[PDB]
């Protein structure tokens, strides 16, 4: 139904080595399509999805250039931010950027965004209205004014509500196969005798996509959130995702518990039982 | 595609 394109940029300074380590990765929904690693022998924007490899030299020159430009801007930003925050040149630091666009069911522009971060914390972000910003601190407001004086917000404002959406809709259209697919969760339950009077019921959900899933544990039809565990949706390393949901129940009462699996891949909320 | 031609340095 809903979709997005997001770019993740990570730049880390390396006191003593040549340049900083720069890593940029492009995402559409939950599947990476481009990467750039300054430490790679390539020094080029590289493809990570088969549906971006369709784009030609013009594209890759532009992305390599833009991303190198991003790298430069970040290399310079590392120095800048280091100065903004007055930090040792012997210390390793991290700038992270994320920006992208969300589309509705009709692919009409929903929302856009541009988040920027230093050493793992929010630095500056483009507001909902795509006209304001975010003064996380003075360093940020410096950048903010530096930006809205440069009319940066309008640049993104056009790119987000326009360019990135257009490209998203382009990737969605060129990546229908893998972007618009829904791999149903491979649900199944496991019974581990945690002890004598208890047994762990683990509700597995394997090889689903997108990662967006809802595992629930009901007991006697009524939802249950106590004694229930749930691991972060992990990648299988092949595009699909894993995610189990355990629960500790008194022996014999296992049938009393049901696992409610919800996913865009399956039209009807699955209910699991047994063990 | 990537924002361009670039930042917009901090």
């Amino acid at each position, epitope marked *: 139904g809903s979709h997005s394109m997001r770019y993740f940029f990570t730049s880390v300074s390396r006191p003593g080595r040549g340049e900083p380590r720069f890593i940029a990765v492009g995402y559409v929904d939950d599947t990476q399509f481009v990467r750039f690693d300054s430490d790679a022998a390539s020094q080029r924007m590289e493809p990570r999805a088969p549906w971006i490899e369709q784009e030609g030299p013009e594209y890759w020159d532009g992305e390599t250039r833009k991303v190198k*430009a991003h790298s430069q801007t970040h290399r310079v930003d590392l120095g800048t931010l280091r100065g903004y925050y007055n930090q040792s040149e012997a210390g390793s630091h991290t700038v992270q950027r994320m920006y992208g666009c969300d589309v509705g069911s009709d692919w009409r522009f929903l929302r856009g965004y541009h988040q920027y971060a230093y050493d793992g914390k929010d630095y500056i972000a483009l507001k909902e209205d795509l006209r304001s910003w975010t003064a996380a601190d003075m360093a940020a407001q410096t950048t903010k004014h530096k930006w809205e004086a440069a009319h940066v917000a309008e640049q993104l404002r056009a790119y987000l509500e326009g360019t990135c959406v257009e490209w998203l809709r382009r990737y969605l259209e060129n990546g229908k196969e893998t972007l618009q697919r829904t791999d149903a969760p491979k649900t199944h339950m496991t019974h581990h005798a945690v002890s004598d009077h208890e047994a762990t019921l683990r509700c597995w959900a394997l090889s689903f996509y997108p990662a967006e899933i809802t595992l629930t544990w009901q007991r006697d039809g009524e939802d249950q959130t106590q004694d229930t565990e749930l691991v972060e949706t992990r990648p299988a390393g092949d595009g699909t995702f894993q995610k189990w949901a355990a629960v500790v129940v008194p022996s014999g009462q296992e049938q009393r518990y049901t696992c409610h699996v919800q996913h865009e891949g399956l039209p009807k909320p699955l209910t699991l039982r047994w063990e | 595609a990537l924002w361009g031609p670039d930042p917009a340095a901090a």
Partner: T-cell receptor
Framework: GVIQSPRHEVTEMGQQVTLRCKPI?????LFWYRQTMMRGLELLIY????????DSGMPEDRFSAKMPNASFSTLKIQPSEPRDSAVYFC??????????????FGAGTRLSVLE | EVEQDPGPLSVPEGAIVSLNCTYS??????FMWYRQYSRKGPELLMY????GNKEDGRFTAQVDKSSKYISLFIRDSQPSDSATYLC???????????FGSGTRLLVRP
């Protein structure tokens, strides 16, 4: 402003010609443009902090651009050819101005390479 | 690439003049008009972020992304004006500016 040297270069072909440019202090974008007689500007190469961002305009062979430092760029031409005869503009700018598409040019270098 | 009438074209002082360029390549988001005297560096006149009209003094910059057709209107041609006018443009990817080969202009006093 943007300082280019020489203002005029009359040199026999086959000899290295060194076009030298000093961008406006602070400007991190250095553009090299060639303007053959009666043509518009052709961007040869532009740097962003000493590194060649878009060298898609460089004629390949003979033309060697570089920015050893931020306040000096060298556009060298080995076996200079008469065809090189043109007005090489060095341009300089910042991101903020570049967003409005403002560039600042030099007086250019009237290069005449003779046979 | 962009095409532009090089023709020197002479106009009598006080006349309206139309300069324009056509370009074979979308993506070009930014469209601007440079003015150039003799061999001196080019100076920007007009800059339109995208399709639409732009009224500045005796000058009017118009951009028709549909027609890939940029234009610059000058009213009451003043003494100066006489010069080569270059249309530039670019977008997204790079700052590599692309210029029209130029339009010489002579406004007769």
């Amino acid at each position: 402003g943007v300082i280019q040297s020489p203002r005029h270069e009359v040199t026999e072909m086959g000899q290295q010609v060194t076009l030298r440019c000093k961008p406006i202090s602070g400007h991190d974008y250095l553009f090299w443009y060639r303007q053959t007689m009666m043509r518009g500007l052709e961007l040869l190469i532009y740097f962003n902090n000493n590194v060649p961002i878009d060298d898609s305009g460089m004629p390949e062979d003979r033309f060697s651009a570089k920015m050893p430092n931020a306040s000096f760029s060298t556009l060298k031409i080995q076996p200079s050819e008469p065809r090189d005869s043109a007005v090489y503009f060095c341009a300089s700018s910042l991101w903020e101005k570049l967003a409005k598409n403002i560039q600042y040019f030099g007086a250019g270098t009237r290069l005449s390479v003779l046979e | 690439e962009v095409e532009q009438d090089p023709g020197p074209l002479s106009v009598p002082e006080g006349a309206i003049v139309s300069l324009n360029c056509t370009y074979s390549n979308s993506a070009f988001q930014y469209f601007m008009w440079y003015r150039q005297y003799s061999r001196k560096g080019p100076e920007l006149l007009m800059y339109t972020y995208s399709s639409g009209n732009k009224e500045d003094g005796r000058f009017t910059a118009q951009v028709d992304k549909s027609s890939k057709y940029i234009s610059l209107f000058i009213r009451d041609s003043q003494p100066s004006d006489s010069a080569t006018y270059l249309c530039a443009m670019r977008g997204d990817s790079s700052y590599k500016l692309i210029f029209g080969s130029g339009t010489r202009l002579l406004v007769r006093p």
